[PDB]
Amino acid sequence: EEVRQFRRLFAQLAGDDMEVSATELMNILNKVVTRHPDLKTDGFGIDTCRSMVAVMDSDTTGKLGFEEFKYLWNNIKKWQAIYKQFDVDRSGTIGSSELPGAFEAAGFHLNEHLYSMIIRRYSDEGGNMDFDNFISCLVRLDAMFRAFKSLDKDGTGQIQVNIQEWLQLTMYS
Amino acid sequence: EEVRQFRRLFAQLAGDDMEVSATELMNILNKVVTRHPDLKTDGFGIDTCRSMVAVMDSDTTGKLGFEEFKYLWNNIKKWQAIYKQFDVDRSGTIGSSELPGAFEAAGFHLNEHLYSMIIRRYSDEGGNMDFDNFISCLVRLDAMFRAFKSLDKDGTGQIQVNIQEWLQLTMYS
Ligand SMILES: O=C(O)[C@@H](S)Cc1ccc(I)cc1
Ligand SMILES: O=C(O)[C@@H](S)Cc1ccc(I)cc1
Ligand SMILES: [Ca+2]
Ligand SMILES: [Ca+2]
Ligand SMILES: [Ca+2]
Ligand SMILES: [Ca+2]
Ligand SMILES: [Ca+2]
Ligand SMILES: [Ca+2]
Ligand SMILES: [Ca+2]
Ligand SMILES: [Ca+2]
16 A cells, blocks of 8 residues: 555654654655756755744644654645646746746645745745745645634634734744 | 944945845855854855845845845844853853743743744754854744734734735745
């Protein structure tokens, strides 16, 4: 099976403490893109990884357990495919005009104002977003959408968040 | 004449487009920090500087103007001085025990839970925070506080926000 094969990757990656840290996450992700010449990236940095872990660590352990990691990995496997598909000019990167289509393929229908804000923060001078930036942007986007949805209990379209919660959601990410 | 000097710095740094981008910021920050052996750091990386710019960019130009860069620079000068004062064991990093007092001097009073989250996201195995992680964290904490006070112009300590608003507050930073 595949769940058999995954426990095997996980158990190997997680190591001694049965959890995968920011550092371990960084290594595996860097070990993989290496064999993907169609993905341009300057590498998955430690800071980006620590952010990926925090935003994915729903149980506040500082590291990712089996489920948390399983969620992250599956998403990443699906997202890398979208990136390749939408980089129609084989630049190895997602361009400004290539972005909306890719996010939509990943299930994120935003607006022109939001894509712009996104390009400004994650893309470079040129409007080109490389692979790590893309995955990084998507892990966060997914977490924030999830976070909003869980706080929208009445189904009203708006949430109420107090100072303590706010600081917890924005700082531990 | 304390600004005579500051205008010449920004102008020299900002360049042709009259704005300090993440890369311009990264360079200067890595240049100065080296002239201070009391601050241990693994370097200011591009993702972190990209984060710093995003959070200080109030005019949504994508870069730091004079007013934006000045507020940022002033804080760093101030936070740099706090870092050194509270690094009692002169390890060159802020430890778990050293943390709250340094934030207390910067003016933030957070609870233990929040501190645990911050240490998990910003410190190392031993629980020490280096210079870039310290500045990066503080630049964020300050921004997140200001963003919150700007929507709670009532003092209730709670904000109402829709999805479009939530994304801009959490994604553009
Ligand atoms: O290359 C792989 O391991 C396959 S299973 C898919 C994949 C591709 C790229 C990344 I980064 C992660 C996962
Ligand atoms: O402004 C400077 O170069 C010195 S005096 C203070 C300072 C020290 C470190 C940093 I990074 C920023 C500022
Ligand atoms: Ca581990
Ligand atoms: Ca966890
Ligand atoms: Ca492309
Ligand atoms: Ca990158
Ligand atoms: Ca410039
Ligand atoms: Ca600006
Ligand atoms: Ca110390
Ligand atoms: Ca660091």
